[PDB]
Design an enzyme around this catalytic site. Structure first.
Site, PDB file in Angstrom:
ATOM      1  N   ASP A 180       6.040   3.384   5.218  1.00  0.00           N
ATOM      2  CA  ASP A 180       6.738   2.180   5.663  1.00  0.00           C
ATOM      3  C   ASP A 180       6.827   1.187   4.517  1.00  0.00           C
ATOM      4  OD1 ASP A 180       4.199   0.137   7.306  1.00  0.00           O
ATOM      5  OD2 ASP A 180       3.894   1.789   5.892  1.00  0.00           O
TER       6      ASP A 180
ATOM      7  N   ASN B 204      -3.124   3.782  13.679  1.00  0.00           N
ATOM      8  CA  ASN B 204      -3.641   4.971  13.020  1.00  0.00           C
ATOM      9  C   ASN B 204      -4.680   4.582  11.981  1.00  0.00           C
ATOM     10  OD1 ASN B 204      -3.733   7.162  10.876  1.00  0.00           O
ATOM     11  ND2 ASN B 204      -2.521   8.198  12.461  1.00  0.00           N
TER      12      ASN B 204
ATOM     13  N   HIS C 136       1.591   3.838   2.029  1.00  0.00           N
ATOM     14  CA  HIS C 136       2.186   4.518   3.179  1.00  0.00           C
ATOM     15  C   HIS C 136       3.712   4.393   3.141  1.00  0.00           C
ATOM     16  CE1 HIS C 136      -1.701   4.399   5.834  1.00  0.00           C
ATOM     17  NE2 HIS C 136      -1.612   5.518   5.138  1.00  0.00           N
TER      18      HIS C 136
ATOM     19  N   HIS D 160       0.857  -1.194   0.000  1.00  0.00           N
ATOM     20  CA  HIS D 160       0.000   0.000   0.000  1.00  0.00           C
ATOM     21  C   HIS D 160       0.891   1.240   0.000  1.00  0.00           C
ATOM     22  CE1 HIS D 160       0.338  -0.419   4.486  1.00  0.00           C
ATOM     23  NE2 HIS D 160       0.106   0.880   4.542  1.00  0.00           N
TER      24      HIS D 160
ATOM     25  N   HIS E  83      -7.012  -1.438   6.535  1.00  0.00           N
ATOM     26  CA  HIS E  83      -6.022  -0.499   7.043  1.00  0.00           C
ATOM     27  C   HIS E  83      -5.914   0.724   6.130  1.00  0.00           C
ATOM     28  CE1 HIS E  83      -2.292   1.288   8.385  1.00  0.00           C
ATOM     29  NE2 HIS E  83      -1.767   1.078   7.189  1.00  0.00           N
TER      30      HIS E  83
HETATM   31  O1  LIG Z   1      -0.205   1.152  11.243  1.00  0.00           O
HETATM   32  C1  LIG Z   1       0.353   0.983  10.122  1.00  0.00           C
HETATM   33  O2  LIG Z   1       0.526  -0.188   9.691  1.00  0.00           O
HETATM   34  C2  LIG Z   1       0.795   2.190   9.313  1.00  0.00           C
HETATM   35  S1  LIG Z   1       1.629   1.961   7.846  1.00  0.00           S
HETATM   36  C3  LIG Z   1       0.671   3.423   9.967  1.00  0.00           C
HETATM   37  C4  LIG Z   1       1.006   4.656   9.158  1.00  0.00           C
HETATM   38  C5  LIG Z   1       0.032   5.504   8.680  1.00  0.00           C
HETATM   39 CL1  LIG Z   1      -1.646   5.170   9.008  1.00  0.00          CL
HETATM   40  C6  LIG Z   1       0.371   6.623   7.929  1.00  0.00           C
HETATM   41  C7  LIG Z   1       1.706   6.895   7.665  1.00  0.00           C
HETATM   42  C8  LIG Z   1       2.679   6.035   8.158  1.00  0.00           C
HETATM   43 CL2  LIG Z   1       4.364   6.323   7.861  1.00  0.00          CL
HETATM   44  C9  LIG Z   1       2.331   4.927   8.903  1.00  0.00           C
HETATM   45 CL3  LIG Z   1       3.559   3.859   9.529  1.00  0.00          CL
HETATM   46 ZN   LIG Z   2      -0.114   1.893   6.324  1.00  0.00          ZN
HETATM   47 ZN   LIG Z   3       2.298  -0.271   8.234  1.00  0.00          ZN
END
Ligand SMILES: O=C(O)/C(S)=C/c1c(Cl)ccc(Cl)c1Cl
Ligand SMILES: [Zn+2]
Ligand SMILES: [Zn+2]
Length: 218
Positions: A81, A171, A79, A77, A140
């Site tokens: 990470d 989040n 984001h 996805h 997610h």
């Molecule tokens: O909880 C998760 O798996 C992720 S990827 C959280 C997140 C979100 Cl929601 C936005 C931005 C970023 Cl950098 C991260 Cl890490």
């Molecule tokens: Zn994410």
């Molecule tokens: Zn993540």
């Protein structure tokens, strides 16, 4: 005990079997998981890492160890990470696979674009390594996909799937908590016999992680 190899310690790889390892990096402090597939035609990663610095170090670690090149990455996805190292992939000629939706969201958020080649179900093969990608619906994030290794019944749940240590959904700003359950159920229906489940963050588990995620959604 499974073989574990570290870089500083910010990057670690753990062996699940002969040709499948989990890669874990420390970003932001938050650990993150992906997969390293050792195939006869090169290394394939499931997901990159938090940024280009970590992604470069990751690639260089596995290329040296397994003595072949990273050729492909599957981005699960949009984001950071997952996709934070996309610049590194593109400039090195590493193919960055994703759904069209993941690519669109990546572009919208200012990241370089992955290929957008993955459909709802896509079957890939790298050397002898079979890889299926599956879009189960929103959870997610609206675009999150899972990755299935049918030769091992290993599921990469990504951030759709919470680890045992996760006591909440984390989040949910980009999440769809009313669809997330159905999407997990779609995974459970498609893969009725699972050996290991790799979550986006935390320890590797099994089908129990999917059930744990369903409970967190209540
Ligand atoms: O909880 C998760 O798996 C992720 S990827 C959280 C997140 C979100 Cl929601 C936005 C931005 C970023 Cl950098 C991260 Cl890490
Ligand atoms: Zn994410
Ligand atoms: Zn993540």
């Amino acid at each position: 005990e499974k073989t574990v190899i570290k870089n500083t310690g910010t990057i670690s790889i753990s062996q699940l079997n002969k040709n499948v390892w989990v890669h874990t990096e420390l970003g932001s402090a938050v650990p993150s998981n992906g997969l390293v597939l050792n195939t006869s035609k090169g290394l394939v990663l499931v997901d990159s890492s938090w940024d280009d610095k970590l992604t470069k170090e990751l690639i260089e670690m596995v290329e040296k160890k397994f003595q072949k090149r990273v050729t492909d990455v599957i981005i699960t996805h949009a984001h950071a990470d997952r996709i934070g190292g996309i610049k590194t992939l593109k400039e090195r000629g590493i193919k960055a696979h994703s759904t069209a939706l993941t690519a669109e969201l990546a572009k919208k958020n200012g990241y370089e674009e992955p290929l957008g080649d993955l459909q709802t179900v896509t079957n890939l093969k790298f050397g002898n390594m079979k890889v299926e990608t599956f879009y189960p619906g929103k959870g997610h994030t609206e675009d999150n996909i899972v990755v299935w290794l049918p030769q091992y019944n290993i599921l990469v749940g990504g951030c759709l799937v919470k680890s045992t240590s996760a006591k909440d959904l984390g989040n949910v700003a980009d999440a769809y908590v009313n669809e997330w359950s159905t999407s997990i159920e779609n995974v459970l229906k498609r893969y009725r016999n699972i050996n290991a489940v790799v979550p986006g963050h935390g320890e590797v588990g099994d089908k129990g992680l999917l059930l744990h995620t369903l409970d967190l959604l209540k």
